[PDB]
Design a protein around this ligand. Sequence first.
Ligand SMILES: *[C@@H]1O[C@H](CO)[C@@H](O[C@@H]2O[C@H](CO)[C@@H](O[C@@H]3O[C@H](CO[C@H]4O[C@H](CO)[C@@H](O)[C@H](O[C@H]5O[C@H](CO)[C@@H](O)[C@H](O)[C@@H]5O[C@H]5O[C@H](CO)[C@@H](O)[C@H](O)[C@@H]5O)[C@@H]4O)[C@@H](O)[C@H](O)[C@@H]3O)[C@H](O)[C@H]2NC(C)=O)[C@H](O)[C@H]1NC(C)=O
Ligand SMILES: *[C@@H]1O[C@H](CO)[C@@H](O[C@@H]2O[C@H](CO)[C@@H](O)[C@H](O)[C@H]2NC(C)=O)[C@H](O)[C@H]1NC(C)=O
Ligand SMILES: *[C@@H]1O[C@H](CO)[C@@H](O[C@@H]2O[C@H](CO)[C@@H](O)[C@H](O)[C@H]2NC(C)=O)[C@H](O)[C@H]1NC(C)=O
Ligand SMILES: CN1CCN(C2=NC(=O)/C(=C/c3ccc(Cl)c(Cl)c3)S2)CC1
Ligand SMILES: [Ca+2]
Ligand SMILES: [K+]
Ligand code: NA
Ligand SMILES: [Zn+2]
Ligand SMILES: [Zn+2]
Length: 801
Amino acid sequence: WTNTSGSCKGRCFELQEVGPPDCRCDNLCKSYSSCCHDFDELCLKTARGWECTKDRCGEVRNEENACHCSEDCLSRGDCCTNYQVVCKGESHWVDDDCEEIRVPECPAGFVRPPLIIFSVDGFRASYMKKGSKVMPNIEKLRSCGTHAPYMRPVYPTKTFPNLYTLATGLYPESHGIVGNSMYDPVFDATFHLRGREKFNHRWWGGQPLWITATKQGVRAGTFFWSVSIPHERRILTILQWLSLPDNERPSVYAFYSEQPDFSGHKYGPFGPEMTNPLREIDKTVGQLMDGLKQLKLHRCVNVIFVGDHGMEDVTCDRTEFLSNYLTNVDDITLVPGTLGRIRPKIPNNLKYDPKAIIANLTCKKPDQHFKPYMKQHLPKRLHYANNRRIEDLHLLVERRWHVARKPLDVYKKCFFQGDHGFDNKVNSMQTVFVGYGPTFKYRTKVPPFENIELYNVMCDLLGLKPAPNNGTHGSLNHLLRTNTFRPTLPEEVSRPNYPGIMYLQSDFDLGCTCDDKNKLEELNKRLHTKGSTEERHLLYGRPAVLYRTSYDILYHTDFESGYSEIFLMPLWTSYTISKQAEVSSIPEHLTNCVRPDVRVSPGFSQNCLAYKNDKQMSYGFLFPPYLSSSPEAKYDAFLVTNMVPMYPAFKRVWTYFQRVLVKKYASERNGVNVISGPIFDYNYNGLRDIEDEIKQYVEGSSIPVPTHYYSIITSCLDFTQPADKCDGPLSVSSFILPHRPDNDESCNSSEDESKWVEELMKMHTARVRDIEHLTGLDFYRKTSRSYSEILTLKTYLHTYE
Ligand SMILES: *[C@@H]1O[C@H](CO)[C@@H](O[C@@H]2O[C@H](CO)[C@@H](O[C@@H]3O[C@H](CO[C@H]4O[C@H](CO)[C@@H](O)[C@H](O[C@H]5O[C@H](CO)[C@@H](O)[C@H](O)[C@@H]5O[C@H]5O[C@H](CO)[C@@H](O)[C@H](O)[C@@H]5O)[C@@H]4O)[C@@H](O)[C@H](O)[C@@H]3O)[C@H](O)[C@H]2NC(C)=O)[C@H](O)[C@H]1NC(C)=O
Ligand SMILES: *[C@@H]1O[C@H](CO)[C@@H](O[C@@H]2O[C@H](CO)[C@@H](O)[C@H](O)[C@H]2NC(C)=O)[C@H](O)[C@H]1NC(C)=O
Ligand SMILES: *[C@@H]1O[C@H](CO)[C@@H](O[C@@H]2O[C@H](CO)[C@@H](O)[C@H](O)[C@H]2NC(C)=O)[C@H](O)[C@H]1NC(C)=O
Ligand SMILES: CN1CCN(C2=NC(=O)/C(=C/c3ccc(Cl)c(Cl)c3)S2)CC1
Ligand SMILES: [Ca+2]
Ligand SMILES: [K+]
Ligand code: NA
Ligand SMILES: [Zn+2]
Ligand SMILES: [Zn+2]
């Protein structure tokens, strides 16, 4: 219970931690219905608006006014933000020329530049193009500070998951806010945008910035604002807090605006009605900058202008209905709209039949505008599976469309033309980032990056040590003038062996057969020694193994590999394909050829008998026989230590990748270096499985079956230089392909591979960093580039938009 009869006199927007029965006066009291009776009259003053006029200059201080134009207001810290312009002949901040801020210019008493995070809801990156015509203050921040062309939100691309991701550096599956609405089966409780349940701390995991700051002795302003507090009051409050005594003043501040999201939903992103809310936001930014200038702080504070997601054209007319596919939709609950999450209406309903549901939802219309996925089958880049609040059954919805349970759930007259929530690589979902201030660079454009990276950077800006999170610390050092984080290479845990010849073909009984033999490499005395293999096929040093295991480096004319004696296959296989390289066939007599590897014990080798027994599993090769340098060298490709288990369904994709796509990439990029390998993630947590976690093996054997296969394709950013002779920065694209027994995911898979395989790979694009998590490997350790630049490279996602 709260004793409302208290008073907010001398307590308006206090940073005091005040708990019941005491009366509250903070920017969240209205949300808890715990404000003092006089909060609204003392703290939410509105009299005479938010701007000084000429007739108010030098007025007698009336404490009834929203803001002041009295002579004393400046030292009192509560002038209207335009006071000095109207009453003292100063210019607005926006009319001032841009000038580099090389060090903080702060008043005495300021020990460090404060950080102000200005968040705008639903600010699509492309709105920035409207420029100073519409948003002159924001355009000044963008052009004079540091900007990205866009920032990638997390999936789902909705507000709650993204705001909390910004605050924590975590994927939603980790922080727990996996949607604006969610059901937790252990709580048996439902979280909603609106309502009280979301105020319970049990939903919110990880460690948000304000907590990290507080725990390390840095004072945070209250980040959240009750929706009823107008933006002008939020700004005036931030400015007042900045005028506080040295021993009370916070170091970090957050402003939030619900626009331009609301107008985007109403009018769509390209609606002419969008100009008005963009102008209003800019006006708020201007009030903040004008205010900071009045406090002599405009060359002291770091400002981050950041959005949570974008906005797409979505209308009633583009709604898919599950009732068109399923017989009894009244028995399921659907989290609907720009994504789908399905569970039974009655929790744990025993009659719930997910396989039959998915079957009815799979490629049933030629123009179907969503695709069903068990969550472990979602593209790994989405990182959206490892949480009990994420339903097993998901629908990835096509941009511009909605999914709904049945037509009763749509009300045409419809009232909306915009929405968001889609796959976070969709262009319309991208949002904004600008950094302005002493610690940011001046007039600098940076490549787009993911919002999970910002928490580390805000920690850097504040001198904080970040809690464990999913950013890669150092990958954004290029945004900063100083306060960069000097990263340190992780230490290799397992050193490799370099086995020579220690066995004879007679030592092997694996059930393998090869109809021909290369008797010439048996006269090769330097066969499978290092030679120039490493400098040709391993351009950036060997991957470090960051876990305890046993593996062997194996050399070949056409490739090198790191063969695991535990998992019975390479952890990685690395090779370079020149622009001019030739594709060749697998000769008829070699179709079923598999050769034992004298370098590796028969005990640490797979056996072809298992593959003859398993009627469902087949096999493939990591280095492709199609790309052998010579008919002689091609024999290396058929080694048992280059072999991996693949379903025939997957082989349709992999062979087309090996035979057509790799050469296509080499042609277009002036040669490519490829590293390919297996991934084991049976518990779908995005992390390398331990042996105990692997759940499937080749029939009657102990050869483990990968859940995915990766490939990392690197070339010279300067495409005029061949990949193997690159002087400067690198260019990378990667994939994590799901290893599945069918191609149900690809609706056109009945057709030739040229009609569907690339479309699949694009969906499963990945960061090198993703692969590192999944493999326990560390790539690019030996290059001519800074470690910070390499970290940037590893976080890059090739999106194909
Ligand atoms: C993204 O980065 C994060 C942060 O580093 C990584 O997540 C971490 O992974 C490790 C390895 O599995 C986990 O270590 C385990 O910790 C548990 C005990 O963990 C408890 O205590 C920690 C510390 O206070 C706390 O963070 C944990 O919070 C989890 O559980 C809470 C209550 O259920 C929940 O509120 C919170 O959201 C979070 O849940 C998430 O993680 C759990 C797994 O712990 C998962 O089941 C859930 O679905 C969410 O994903 C928890 O109270 C020990 O018992 C183990 O032995 C082991 O040491 C960390 O717990 C985990 N940290 C967080 C914050 O998630 C991700 O791996 C990384 N992803 C990628 C792909 O790189
Ligand atoms: C709720 O708040 C009111 C106002 O603070 C409290 O009223 C005061 O109570 C004290 C002690 O009984 C009196 O001496 C004062 O005269 C009261 N102050 C005013 C301004 O009226 C009231 O006690 C609180 N109720 C509780 C504690 O449950
Ligand atoms: C999947 O779709 C089929 C139709 O393609 C549904 O089959 C109908 O189901 C009812 C009862 O099972 C039958 O009486 C109808 O004759 C069927 N319709 C037709 C035209 O075949 C099936 O119910 C759907 N499955 C689920 C789980 O929704
Ligand atoms: C439905 N909802 C209304 C309120 N809401 C918020 N109101 C605020 O004042 C918020 C401040 C904020 C500002 C920055 C960050 Cl990083 C975070 Cl986590 C929160 S967030 C979220 C969307
Ligand atoms: Ca795992
Ligand atoms: K077979
Ligand atoms: Na198919
Ligand atoms: Zn939003
Ligand atoms: Zn919205």
